[PDB]
């Protein structure tokens, strides 16, 4: 109940988005009239948040994940506040004589150049060459300070940061930021990286699909547990925005084969509702 989906073409391809009373828009990008089984793509939903900047490193602490393969997905249960450290990569294979900027300084976003490639995010440049070949260009997008040899406890690269902390006399720190020093050529810099706070709910808001049928010996009831295809050990090297999770639909039912179709069945008003039907049709001969 409380469904409303019609045709809507404004920005791209075919697009049949549904309407709910919980103010959450759901959509499957595949063609209407598909054939699916268990553990498949059934729908997804847009997100106002989770529009990330670039890649980075993720290390979750105190939340459980349960999956065997990395390409399957982890049925998450708890929530918890997890890490997000911004770090932009450039996976290229140019020469070191194609290198245009010096490593260890501050460039600006867009108006700079890294080996015939325009930049995206302003930050501190990190380079690794192996065999006189530029294998990657790393630009950590963070604000940069230049004050070394403190003689204090400013090395805190393990734990996180608090706004009421002190790392040096006269250092502005308001937002959560991780600290590690810059081994600059004839430079005394120290960069802080803007760690962003991320957190997800326990279980997502979705109305339970009520059944008006007989349901003798069996019943259909799918749950919506969003999957994790990131882990601790992986670091993502996206040059652009990449989402972490997808608010999406997966249908399970209890070898076994199933072919489910979708249509639009509505006998109350002139609209179209959510319809996902199966029936094991046999064929008695009329003859």
């Amino acid at each position: 109940d409380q469904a409303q989906v019609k045709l809507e073409s404004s920005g791209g391809r075919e697009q049949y988005v549904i309407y709910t009373a919980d103010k959450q828009r759901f959509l499957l990008k595949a063609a209407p009239g598909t054939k699916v089984q268990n553990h498949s793509i059934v729908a997804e939903l847009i997100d106002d948040r989770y529009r990330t900047t670039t890649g980075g490193m993720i290390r979750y602490a105190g939340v459980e994940v349960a999956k065997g393969g990395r390409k399957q997905g982890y049925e998450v249960t708890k929530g918890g506040t997890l890490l997000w450290i911004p770090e932009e990569t450039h996976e290229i294979n140019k020469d070191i004589s194609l290198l245009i900027v010096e490593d260890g300084q501050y460039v600006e976003a867009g108006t700079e150049v890294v080996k015939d490639i325009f930049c995206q995010s302003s930050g501190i440049v990190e380079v690794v060459q192996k065999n006189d070949i530029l294998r990657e260009i790393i630009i950590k997008p963070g604000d940069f300070y230049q004050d070394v040899d403190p003689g204090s406890v400013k090395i805190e690269s393990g734990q996180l940061l608090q706004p009421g902390q002190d790392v040096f006399p006269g250092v502005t720190v308001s937002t959560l930021s991780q600290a590690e020093w810059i081994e600059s050529p004839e430079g005394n810099g120290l960069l802080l990286r803007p760690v962003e706070e991320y957190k997800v709910f326990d279980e997502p808001a979705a109305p339970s699909q009520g059944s008006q049928n007989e349901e003798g010996g069996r019943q259909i009831e799918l749950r919506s547990v969003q999957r994790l295809f990131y882990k601790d050990g992986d670091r993502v090297k996206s040059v652009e925005g990449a989402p972490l999770l997808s608010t999406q639909l997966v249908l399970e039912i209890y070898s076994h084969l199933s072919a489910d179709i979708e249509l639009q069945d509505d006998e109350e008003e002139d609209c179209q509702r959510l319809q996902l039907v199966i029936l094991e049709s046999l064929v008695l001969r009329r003859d």
């Binding site: 294979n93 140019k94 020469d95 004589s97 194609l98 080996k115 015939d116 065999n131 070949i133 294998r135």
Partner: protein
């Protein structure tokens, strides 16, 4: 034969440039010493001649590897020129000659991949 990667292409292009400058100094020595340079070399100026032969063998093997690994591009290009008057194998062999010229004219200090310049020379040789 398998397909190459990009750092492989950079290293093979460096060895090909080494081979071509060695052949340039060999050609000017033949133009100076009346075509008797088989025992003459400026890369040294007994074990040094063995090292010179090993270097020449590795550079020639690098050129042959860069030519051999890209023969799939010739077949992907020459399948478009099929019915103009030549058979398929003649187009493949002439595009292979164009790929040889592209492998001996490649510049790795420009940042561009080998496939674009190779496609230009293969289509040139086919036409």
């Amino acid at each position: 034969i398998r397909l190459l990667r990009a750092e492989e292409e950079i290293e093979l292009a460096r060895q090909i440039a080494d081979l071509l400058e060695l052949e340039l100094i060999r050609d000017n020595l033949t133009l100076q010493l009346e075509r008797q340079p088989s025992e003459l070399e400026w890369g040294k100026q007994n074990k040094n001649f063995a090292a010179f032969r090993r270097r020449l063998f590795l550079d020639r093997r690098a050129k042959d590897k860069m030519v051999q690994s890209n023969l799939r591009l010739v077949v992907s290009i020459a399948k478009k020129y099929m019915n103009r008057g030549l058979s398929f194998q003649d187009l493949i062999q002439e595009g292979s000659l164009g790929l040889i010229r592209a492998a001996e004219k490649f510049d790795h200090e420009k940042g561009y991949k080998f496939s674009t310049y190779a496609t230009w020379w293969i289509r040139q040789a086919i036409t």
